[PDB]
């Protein structure tokens, strides 16, 4: 899911793939660039990518429309204590499904036991797992001198 700022007129910037096919984009209505707490504003944006391209295909094959909006929290979702309210609730993407603000989650949500107990998942569209990201080691000799 690539998020990019909308143009001045409010439309989606038109960019073409290398092969010449056009990039499909949808208008997101996520929060500001930094956070919506102090700058309480949800600027519209342009969204495109693998999940959105898959979402557009789902709509055509199931005959429905959509309103894509980013996550207010910016987090995928976990169960949290939060002693201030003394209640277990989900935060973010997982918390927007159950609260009714979202009918669907078209995003990289992994299928968890904790998540699958409350919400249901489709069959995976991307089989994956957990790895490590480390910096490439640029070769460079430690030979100080010929001696």
């Amino acid at each position: 899911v690539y998020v990019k700022p909308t143009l001045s007129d409010g439309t989606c910037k038109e960019e073409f793939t290398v092969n010449g096919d056009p990039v499909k984009k949808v208008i997101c209505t996520g929060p500001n660039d930094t956070s919506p707490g102090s700058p309480r504003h949800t600027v519209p944006q342009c969204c495109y990518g693998f999940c959105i391209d898959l979402l557009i295909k789902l709509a055509r094959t199931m005959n429905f429309t959509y309103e894509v909006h980013l996550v207010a929290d910016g987090k995928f979702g976990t169960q949290e204590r939060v002693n201030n309210s003394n209640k277990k609730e989900w935060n973010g993407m997982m918390g927007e499904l159950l609260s009714g603000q979202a009918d669907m989650i078209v995003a990289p949500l992994t299928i968890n036991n904790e998540r699958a107990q409350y919400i249901e998942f489709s069959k995976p569209f991307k089989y994956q797992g957990l790895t490590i990201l480390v910096k490439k080691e640029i070769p460079r000799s430690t030979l100080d001198s010929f001696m």
């Binding site: 009918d103 409350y118 995976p124 994956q128």
Partner: peptide, 10 residues
């Protein structure tokens, strides 16, 4: 190894 799914309500 758990993949990505489209999540909806029950």
């Amino acid at each position: 190894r758990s993949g990505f799914g489209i999540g909806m309500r029950k």
